[PDB]
Design a protein around this ligand. Structure first.
Ligand code: SF4
Ligand code: SF4
Ligand code: FES
Ligand SMILES: [Zn+2]
Lengths: 82, 107, 114, 208, 95, 126, 48, 688
């Protein structure tokens, strides 16, 4: 059918966190303006691999790892998922 | 008893008509007296022999580990040399001739 | 960590001693099941002996395997002597458990049991 | 300080201090702590490579006879790497003195098994093997004294609980005594008795 | 002297009588529920409220080392009599 | 001698005799005990107590007691540092949750500021 | 006790029921403790 | 570098200037015994037990209130130190009655412990022993003022933290009563904390009074509910059925205090509990049965019902494990209307982007603030320890505190800006004598109460608060990562459910009426059978339901907050877990255990078995819920503010008012506090 949720999991001192912070500071109001009803939610804890989880269709949770991806690479993989 | 209310309990008349005696009775029976930390081994001449007690006490109200030297245990250790060259009625006489109670030998 | 051994040097002598002890336990069962007048065939006794040897299979440290060999040799000496009674040899088995199941659902009907 | 306070003597204290210093001088290889307590009993704290040399020295040497052996125990202390403490408790005959040779060990180390130089240590060593779990190498017989044969777990540890894991009862199914897991009839209420407020200031360890 | 539930079994001084849906009614079959038939509440309401002419008065319990330790109680309220926690017997003041 | 050379964890869990149920079922909470708040004394600190989780304590249907199917519940293991606690808990086999030690904050109190002029630290009752 | 029978104390038994094991009248133990946790009561009315 | 040398017992230590002698002796580890010093209150010199000798000095000085001169040398175990301590102890036990058997602090007194470890053995004082008539402070606090030692610690506590000013010393000499002169019931918040403050057994607990003894009840770490702060607690339990809730201490939140409702809300935890799964009987009644019947019924109905028509209202006091299991199951069915009871608005990126639904600064971090403006709340009755933190900050250093919405009985003299959302509009515009104070402030904080956010103006109020936040973000230099804006909540499970990503509010159920709904602790009038089609199939899951439990269809007895290993989140994102102190009475399984067994009996499965696998999926949903007792704040105020700039709502100028207006509405507005009797007694005591 379609998506239900997109979850981002981040940290505060990493080159991968540097890339996804570049993405989430530059192109997040665009994404929320595009899809209204996708609760794409962001979490930050202390230090973890920056996971990206897509939950849809009877508990299919597809997983990509955003380890040291730059912001263009993050946006390209996020559009590959969505 | 001793002249110290913090170890022996005070007598009942002073307990009733005294505040500090009631407080020392109450704490001395709930918590008990504390013991300074350390280890000791004393032994006295019980009728079986050197009855020994080895206390190990962390500084607290409970002992940490006690252990008992039993003269009956030490005597029963040498039953082989006491019954090597004799018969079995003499084995019963050897078991009898040392004051062994089999509750103290267990520890 | 230059540790003093018990008996061995590595796992090779450990495997040698445990297969010696298993050979002894294999040739030690039918004498005892004739002696203590049990109720269990020889094959089931041998299967539970090899089950007791398969229980500790994930042990890797050589001192620990040496100490288990010592435990098994002590109990084999106490069973080849007539010191242990019928009670302890039947206590090795499990006939009076009414054993608790391992499914989550029957652990749920008798609960508070993780 | 005169009534109801135990009077200590200083002659025995000075003599045991001098003798402990003398012992640690003549055996430099195996000696770590030489302590005299306030009530004058000597303690020598020992690495577990010299049990046979220290006890062969102390049974002989003619300036310290120490013929008799008493309690042997290995008090089960957590919080350390080497847990157990083996306490040989040596009593002389010609001298009226008491020394405690305290050697240390962990759970998986053979100490040198003093049965050859003290024949009284046979059942002491076998009992400490059964109750604590410290194996003794080059030793004639290790069996289970003071425990049941089908029982195991080395129960005098702090890790073994107060009530055991097995409990016996007779049943008429198999017409014998069987072992079942423990189902106590009362809780054994543990009391929280260790009150604060530091009843001894002289035993304050220095903080971090 | 004692109350009794309509199940036929005596209550105690603590109200612990069983319901219609228990089995301890069956464990009492053939053997009597040995209840103390002497309640402790009603043997104090029969006591005379003592009137002592001082203001703060002592309570021993009738005998040196036969009784509770001494409690000194105050009698300054006008509508509630002072009450020993050990004894249970009241006092008043007179002036 | 010293023949054995190996750097591995210890596996005493197959030697200590406690069965697999009470090995892999329960869990060890490792904690400094909190100060008994009605009293004011931190002598009950400085000892890392290892305790286990509690389990069912039903009613004994003849008296009204607290029967239990719990051998290991009445243990406490007082330690002196977190590292030896973690080492013993990983050595002897069972799971562990290590909580945190929370020191009292070093404040600065002053009677002279309890009697100030313009500030709002005017106690007005002593 | 014909000299001085002490401490009369009106609550004392005047009967002295003797040792009574193996009778119809003997002691049975029971919990002298009221309701523990007070389970819920369903409503009496139905819906619809 | 501001160091002074003190030789405590000869041993040297460096100590900052200004501190007391007792803080230096605790810096080396010693304890000088004390009765009227307390590490949360002002220092008075009344008790005189604290005396200690300084070398080369004639007098014996008081260690509670002595500053540190250069180069001390302090003898804590000298001759006259011990003589002074034994003397003061021999004075204190004179006018103190023989009540140590009947007393309530008999295991936990301080006269007893110090008269053991410092005092004399034989007594004196053959005649005397005054007795004082006791008072009635409240129906929650039993008061025997005969045992009082006049240490004056209840008074300093009431005046400096409770702010009530009712307790006073009266008289002179021996005749110094400590109490209220005018027979007035001391009834306020934090009235329960006074029983832990009084070190002798004078001010003791009324419902606890004569029921336990502290060497028997074992202590268990646990975490509070019903408050967004989550104070730490220790349940002293008796024998598989508990005793009492003392407060466990945390330095950041809820230091040594506790809420009155928390302290006295376990009578309802043992008064009306559910012990048996219950099914509606076709005569019309509500009978009970075994687990097989109820779970087979719910399983067959859930198998025969899919689509967008399944609802899960998870309100009140529920877990994180229960929420994970429920969301995983109802994900497996088809779809979701998962809701919370209390209504939080989600228009400008509500559930996502963490910063706009929790309390961003530390609760301890409000001490370094300077201008605090409360909007739409009465913080005395909503997390009262946060109010105690505000009053402690306002007392020690300076705070400009301003309140918008209601003239209420805060105890610390707030400035008042009015009751209108147009006032907040004009503050965002920039025309007040107080917005000047904001743009001239240093570290500002705007605290929004969620109680005025329940009404029909929520997104507009939140957008105006984000306007204030972005306004101070722009019209100032960025001094650091200080955070102006934060909201606070009432119930912790709303914070957990918005962390796990639920829909807040019940609007998704108002749009799509379902055929099956799970009430995980629906407290109030969230939904009824009147707001729903005929085939309801309400599955209630919880303990002592009072509203909805007659209305529901299948009753499942869930556990309680002292009775299961849960995972709770406070209002600032810190994860705190409870511990199993008492197993739940009756059949009474846990919540996620019921849900996964329901998944097994239905024609599906949940891919986990035990609680470690549950917490692994908890980390695989949101990662901060495994770093226990630890906080990390969010960011992106600019992105949250620009996402708030799409939908304009009309701000209704009706007078916004919090419901928590007085003592009765603090005491009654929960299920656990509603079920009890002690809350009912103090309700009728306050209202009468
Ligand atoms: S407050 Fe302390 S000294 Fe006074 S009666 Fe109670 S336990 Fe005894
Ligand atoms: S009532 Fe308690 S806190 Fe208040 S002065 Fe008396 S002893 Fe101190
Ligand atoms: S603490 Fe210094 S006088 Fe009470
Ligand atoms: Zn009296």
């Amino acid at each position: 059918l379609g998506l239900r949720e997109i979850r981002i999991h981040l940290c505060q001192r990493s080159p991968g966190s540097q890339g996804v912070r570049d993405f989430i500071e530059k192109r997040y109001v665009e994404l929320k303006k595009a899809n209204p009803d996708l609760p794409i939610l962001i979490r930050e804890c202390s230090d973890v691999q920056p996971k990206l989880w897509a939950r849809y269709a009877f508990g299919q949770e597809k997983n990509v790892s955003l380890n040291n991806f730059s912001a263009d690479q993050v946006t390209r993989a996020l559009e590959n998922v969505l | 008893k001793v002249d110290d209310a913090k170890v022996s309990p005070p007598k009942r008349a002073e307990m009733k008509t005294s505040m500090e005696s009631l407080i020392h009775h109450f704490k001395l029976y709930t918590e008990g007296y504390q013991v300074p930390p350390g280890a000791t081994y004393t032994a006295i001449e019980a009728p079986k022999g050197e009855f020994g007690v080895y206390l190990v006490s962390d500084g607290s109200s409970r002992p940490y580990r006690c252990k008992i030297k039993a003269p009956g245990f030490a005597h029963l250790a040498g039953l082989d040399k006491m019954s090597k060259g004799h018969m079995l009625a003499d084995v019963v006489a050897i078991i009898g001739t040392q004051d062994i109670v089999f509750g103290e030998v267990d520890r | 960590t230059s540790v003093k051994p018990i008996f061995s040097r590595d796992m090779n002598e450990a495997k040698r001693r445990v297969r010696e002890l298993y050979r002894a336990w294999y040739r030690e069962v039918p004498n005892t099941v004739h002696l203590f007048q049990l109720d269990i065939s020889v094959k089931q006794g041998r299967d539970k002996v090899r089950e007791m040897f398969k229980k500790n299979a994930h042990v890797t440290d050589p001192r620990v395997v040496d100490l288990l060999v010592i435990k098994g040799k002590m109990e084999l000496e106490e069973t080849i002597n007539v010191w242990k009674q019928r009670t302890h040899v039947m206590r090795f088995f499990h006939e009076t458990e009414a054993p608790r199941p391992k499914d989550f659902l029957s652990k749920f009907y008798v609960g508070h049991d993780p | 300080t005169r009534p109801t306070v135990r009077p200590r003597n200083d002659v025995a204290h000075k003599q045991l201090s001098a003798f402990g210093e003398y012992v640690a001088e003549i055996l430099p290889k195996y000696v770590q702590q030489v302590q005299v307590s306030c009530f004058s009993e000597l303690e020598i704290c020992i690495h577990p490579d010299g049990v046979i040399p220290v006890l062969t020295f102390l049974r002989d040497h003619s300036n310290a006879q120490f013929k008799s052996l008493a309690d042997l125990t290995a008090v089960d202390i957590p919080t350390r790497q080497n847990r157990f403490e083996i306490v040989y408790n040596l009593l002389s005959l010609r001298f009226n003195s008491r020394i405690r040779v305290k050697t240390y060990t962990d759970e998986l180390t053979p100490v040198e098994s003093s049965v050859s130089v003290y024949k009284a240590a046979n059942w002491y060593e076998r009992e400490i093997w059964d109750m604590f779990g410290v194996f003794f190498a080059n030793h004639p017989d290790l069996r289970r004294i003071l425990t049941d044969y089908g029982f195991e777990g080395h129960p005098f540890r702090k890790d073994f609980p107060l009530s055991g894991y097995v409990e016996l009862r007779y049943d008429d199914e198999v017409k014998r005594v069987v072992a079942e897991p423990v189902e106590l009839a009362q809780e054994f209420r543990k009391f929280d008795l260790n009150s604060p407020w530091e009843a001894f200031p002289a035993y304050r360890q220095p903080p971090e | 002297g004692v109350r009794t539930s309509p199940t036929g079994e005596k209550v105690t001084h603590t109200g612990q009588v069983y319901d219609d849906e228990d089995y301890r009614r069956v464990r009492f079959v053939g053997r009597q529920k040995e209840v103390n038939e002497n309640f402790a509440i009603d043997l104090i309401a029969e006591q005379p409220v003592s009137q002592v002419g001082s203001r703060v008065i002592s309570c021993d319990g009738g005998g040196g080392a036969l009784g509770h330790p001494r409690v000194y109680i105050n009698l300054d309220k006008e509508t509630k009599t002072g009450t020993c926690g050990y004894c249970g017997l009241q006092f008043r003041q007179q002036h | 001698t010293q023949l054995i050379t190996v750097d591995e964890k210890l596996d005493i869990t197959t030697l200590t005799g406690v069965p697999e149920e009470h090995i892999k079922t329960r869990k060890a909470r490792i904690f400094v005990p909190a100060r008994n708040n009605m009293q004011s004394g931190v002598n009950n600190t400085k000892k890392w107590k290892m305790e286990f989780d509690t389990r069912e304590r039903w009613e004994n249907p003849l008296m009204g007691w607290a029967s239990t199917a719990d051998p290991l519940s009445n243990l406490v293991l007082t330690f002196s540092t977190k590292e030896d606690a973690i080492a013993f808990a990983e050595k002897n086999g069972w799971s562990y949750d290590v909580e945190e030690r929370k020191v009292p904050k070093p404040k600065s109190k002053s009677y002279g500021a309890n009697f100030s002029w313009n500030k709002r630290t005017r106690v007005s009752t002593k | 006790p014909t000299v001085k029978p002490p401490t009369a104390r009106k609550f004392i038994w005047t009967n002295h029921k003797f040792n009574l094991s193996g009778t119809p009248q003997q002691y049975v133990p029971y919990s002298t403790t009221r309701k523990k946790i007070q389970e819920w009561v369903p409503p009496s009315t139905p819906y619809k | 570098s501001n160091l002074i040398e003190v030789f405590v017992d000869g041993q040297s230590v460096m100590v900052e200037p200004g501190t007391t002698v007792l803080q230096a002796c605790e810096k080396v580890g010693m304890q000088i015994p004390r009765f009227c010093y307390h590490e949360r209150l002002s220092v008075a010199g009344n008790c005189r037990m604290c005396l200690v000798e300084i070398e080369k000095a004639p007098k014996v000085v008081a260690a509670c209130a002595m500053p540190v001169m250069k180069g001390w040398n302090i003898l804590t175990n000298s001759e006259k130190t011990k003589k002074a301590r034994e003397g003061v102890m021999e004075f204190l036990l004179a006018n103190h009655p023989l009540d140590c058997p009947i007393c309530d602090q008999g295991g936990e007194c301080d006269l007893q412990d110090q008269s053991m470890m410092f005092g004399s053995d034989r007594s004196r004082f053959l005649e005397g022993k005054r007795a004082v008539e006791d008072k009635n402070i409240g129906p929650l606090v039993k008061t025997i003022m005969t045992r009082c030692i006049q240490c004056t610690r209840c008074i300093r506590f009431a005046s400096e933290i409770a702010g009530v000013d009712d307790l006073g010393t009266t008289g002179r000499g021996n005749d110094m009563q400590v109490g209220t002169y005018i027979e007035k019931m001391f009834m306020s918040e934090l009235s329960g904390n006074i029983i832990d403050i009084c070190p002798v057994g004078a001010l003791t607990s009324k419902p606890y009074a004569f029921t336990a003894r502290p060497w028997e009840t074992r202590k268990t770490e646990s975490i509070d509910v019903m408050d967004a702060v989550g104070s730490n607690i220790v349940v002293s339990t008796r024998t598989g059925e508990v005793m009492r809730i003392l407060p466990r201490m945390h330095e950041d939140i809820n230091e040594e205090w506790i809420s009155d409702k928390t302290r006295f809300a376990y009578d309802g935890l043992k008064r009306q509990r559910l012990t048996e799964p219950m099914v509606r009987n076709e005569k019309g009644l509500l009978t009970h049965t075994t687990w097989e019947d109820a779970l087979s019924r719910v399983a067959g109905m859930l198998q025969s019902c899919q689509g967008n028509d399944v609802a899960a209202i998870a309100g009140g006091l529920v877990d994180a494990e229960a929420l994970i299991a429920l969301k995983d199951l109802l994900n497996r069915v088809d779809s979701d209307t998962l809701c919370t009871e209390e209504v939080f608005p989600t228009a400008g990126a509500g559930t996502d982007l963490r910063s706009n639904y929790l309390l961003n600064t530390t609760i301890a971090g409000v001490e370094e603030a300077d201008v605090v403006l409360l909007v739409g709340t009465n913080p005395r009755f909503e997390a009262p320890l946060f109010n105690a933190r505000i009053r402690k900050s306002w007392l020690h250093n300076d705070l400009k505190v301003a309140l918008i919405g209601s003239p209420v009985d805060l105890t610390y003299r707030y400035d008042h800006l009015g009751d209108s959302p147009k006032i907040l509009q004009d503050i965002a515009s920039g025309s007040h004598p107080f917005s000047q104070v904001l743009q001239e402030a240093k570290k500002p904080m705007v605290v929004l109460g969620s109680s005025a956010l329940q009404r029909n103006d929520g997104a507009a109020i939140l957008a105006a608060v984000s306007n204030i936040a972005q306004k101070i973000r722009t019209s100032s230099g960025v001094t650091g990562d200080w955070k102006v804006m934060n909201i606070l909540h009432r119930i912790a499970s709303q914070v957990a459910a918005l962390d796990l990503g639920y829909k807040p509010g019940v609007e998704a159920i108002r749009k799509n009426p379902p055929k099956m709904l799970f009430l995980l602790g629906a407290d109030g009038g969230c939904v009824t059978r009147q707001d729903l089609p005929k085939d309801c199939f309400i599955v209630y899951q919880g303990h002592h339901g009072d509203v909805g439990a007659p209305i529901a269809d299948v009753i499942l007895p869930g556990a309680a907050y002292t009775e299961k290993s849960a995972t709770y989140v406070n209002t600032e994102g810190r994860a705190q877990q409870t511990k199993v102190a008492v197993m739940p009475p009756g059949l009474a399984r846990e919540d996620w255990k019921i849900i996964r067994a329901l998944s097994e009996i239905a024609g599906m499965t949940l891919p986990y078995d035990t609680l470690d696998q549950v917490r692994n999926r908890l980390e695989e949903v949101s990662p901060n819920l495994v770093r226990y007792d630890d906080v990390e704040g969010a960011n992106y105020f600019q992105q949250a503010s620009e996402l708030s700039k799409l939908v304009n709502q009309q701000l209704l100028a009706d007078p916004l008012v919090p419901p928590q207006l007085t003592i009765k509405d603090f005491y009654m507005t929960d299920s656990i506090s509603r079920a009890s009797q002690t809350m009912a007694k103090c309700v009728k005591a306050v209202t009468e």
